[PDB]
Ligand binder design. Structure first.
Ligand SMILES: Cc1cc2nc3c(=O)[nH]c(=O)nc-3n(C[C@H](O)[C@H](O)[C@H](O)COP(=O)(O)OP(=O)(O)OC[C@H]3O[C@@H](n4cnc5c(N)ncnc54)[C@H](O)[C@@H]3O)c2cc1C
Length: 456
């Protein structure tokens, strides 16, 4: 990367906001997955959207790849600089604006996390529900198409992103639904917002997100329920969904995951395949939901509910840190994770099969999942130096992905494709799907400089 180019970057954002130091680049060359670190040639911190536009235009016209970087909590290698280039860390733009409580909407910049937003909203009676375990950038969550434990009731990022401000690869500024606009529904033209949700930094740089807010629930009850088998826990889940109980949260942990979370968070749940549950409503509707849900879990051998502000907060903090609980089983390890999502009636087959396949192998694996969406993760601990085991883990993940595709599902419910699932995506949507996706990529990023090597 030439000295003249570095000076041009510094002229846009300021000398302190450009770094070519090896240690700084290495810290921005990896995320939380096992994908090996590939450092960008420079890291740049733009201070406003005009600077984002000017950095993008500079890189684009000089043939330098651009890698958007939020909080670096992704798990598919999205920020790995496989072709070098400039990593654009967006988190100094951290303002909340256009809070419209009467319309249930707010605008956030990339440095705003879910925790920051919900702190800003206390005593408003509103909250933002999409809750990945990590303290991630909300714009990064829009870029990956994230979901969370609350999505079963309150929707994913795709359901809750109303508008996006995007710097396109050559620097033009796009407001996907129109500048300043916010509304419940529209048929006006093609829905551009949905195209950029889940684009993972390959179509442009999200510099603000307009988010749907939700009313805080009148009352909340959380509980855990232990089961004799994975089959019994997942059968209960499917039957709760088929009975249309509007559960707020329904999370599955297998016995390995439950033990790991016990050791990592000082929960003391019985070591068993377990559902973490949460219900929202008035006392009238809560009693009803609890009736019907306990009836179904009882039929499948579930325990009497172990009830859980502080202990509920402990419970979900433990769930949100399950990834790190899994890592603590094998200290010094990184992990890869599957993330399939299947038609819910096929969820029992594939989780029970996954549990059986994990035991039939020497692999360490923990299972946790948004099973209310028909989605789950197998978190696979890897020694960073054991090449044999690492290709056993990638082969396991590949096979599980193809099993989900055989059942009519998808290879990723929320984490994305990044570097790891590109072959699975080709199988998932076929040749005409791949070409159509590539044609959209090419019109927005003709030079292929927008996070190259990812997704397609
Ligand atoms: C403990 C743990 C728990 C998690 N739980 C969940 C979960 O329940 N659900 C879930 O969906 N994910 C989960 N994740 C994954 C991760 O938190 C999400 O994918 C999150 O959306 C990533 O945001 P980020 O800013 O940290 O991404 P980064 O790693 O910074 O970036 C991810 C990708 O998005 C791109 N990108 C980032 N910001 C922008 C932007 N502003 N504009 C354009 N492209 C951008 C990057 O180029 C990259 O390709 C978890 C991760 C961890 C470590």
């Amino acid at each position: 990367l030439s000295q003249d180019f570095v000076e041009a970057l510094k002229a846009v954002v300021g000398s302190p906001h450009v770094s070519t130091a090896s240690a700084v680049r290495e810290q921005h060359g990896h995320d939380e997955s096992m994908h090996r670190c590939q450092p960008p040639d420079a890291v740049v911190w733009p201070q406003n959207v005009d600077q984002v536009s000017r950095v993008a235009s500079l890189c684009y016209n000089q043939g330098v790849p651009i890698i958007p970087f939020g909080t670096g909590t992704g798990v598919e290698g999205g920020v790995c600089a496989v072709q070098g280039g400039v990593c654009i860390n967006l988190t100094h733009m951290d303002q909340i604006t256009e809070l419209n409580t009467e319309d249930f909407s707010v605008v956030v910049e990339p440095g705003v996390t879910r925790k920051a937003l919900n702190t800003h909203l206390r005593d408003s009676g509103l909250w933002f529900p999409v809750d990945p375990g990590a303290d991630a950038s909300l714009c990064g969550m829009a870029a990956t198409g994230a979901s969370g434990t609350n999505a079963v009731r309150y929707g994913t990022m795709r359901d809750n992103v109303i508008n996006l401000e995007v710097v396109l690869p050559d620097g033009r500024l796009l407001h996907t639904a129109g500048r300043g606009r916010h509304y419940r529904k529209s048929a006006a033209g093609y829905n551009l917002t949905g195209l950029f949700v889940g684009s993972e930094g390959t179509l442009g740089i999200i510099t603000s997100t307009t988010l749907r807010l939700h009313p805080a629930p009148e009352a909340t009850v959380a509980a855990t329920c232990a089961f004799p088998s994975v089959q019994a826990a997942v059968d209960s889940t499917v039957q709760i969904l088929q009975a249309a109980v509007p559960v707020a949260r329904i999370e599955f942990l297998d016995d390995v995951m439950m033990d790991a979370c016990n050791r990592h968070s000082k929960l003391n749940c019985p070591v068993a395949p377990t559902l973490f549950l949460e219900f929202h409503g008035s006392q009238q509707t809560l009693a009803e939901q609890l009736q019907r849900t306990e009836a179904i879990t009882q039929d499948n051998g579930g325990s009497h509910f172990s009830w859980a502000a502080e202990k509920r907060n402990e419970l979900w903090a433990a769930r949100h840190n399950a990834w790190y609980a899994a890592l603590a089983l094998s200290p010094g390890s990184k992990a890869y994770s599957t993330d399939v999502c299947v038609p819910i009636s096929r969820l029992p087959e594939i989780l029970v099969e996954t549990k059986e396949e994990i035991k039939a192998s020497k692999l360490t694996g923990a299972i946790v999942g948004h099973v209310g969406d028909g989605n789950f993760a197998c978190i696979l601990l890897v020694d960073p130096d054991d090449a044999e085991e690492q290709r056993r883990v990638k082969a396991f993940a590949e096979n599980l992905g193809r099993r989900a595709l055989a059942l009519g599902g998808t290879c990723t419910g929320e984490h994305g494709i990044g570097l790891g699932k590109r072959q699975l995506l080709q199988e998932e949507v076929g040749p005409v799907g791949v070409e159509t996706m590539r044609q959209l990529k090419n019109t927005l990023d003709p030079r292929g400089l927008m996070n190259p090597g990812k997704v397609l």
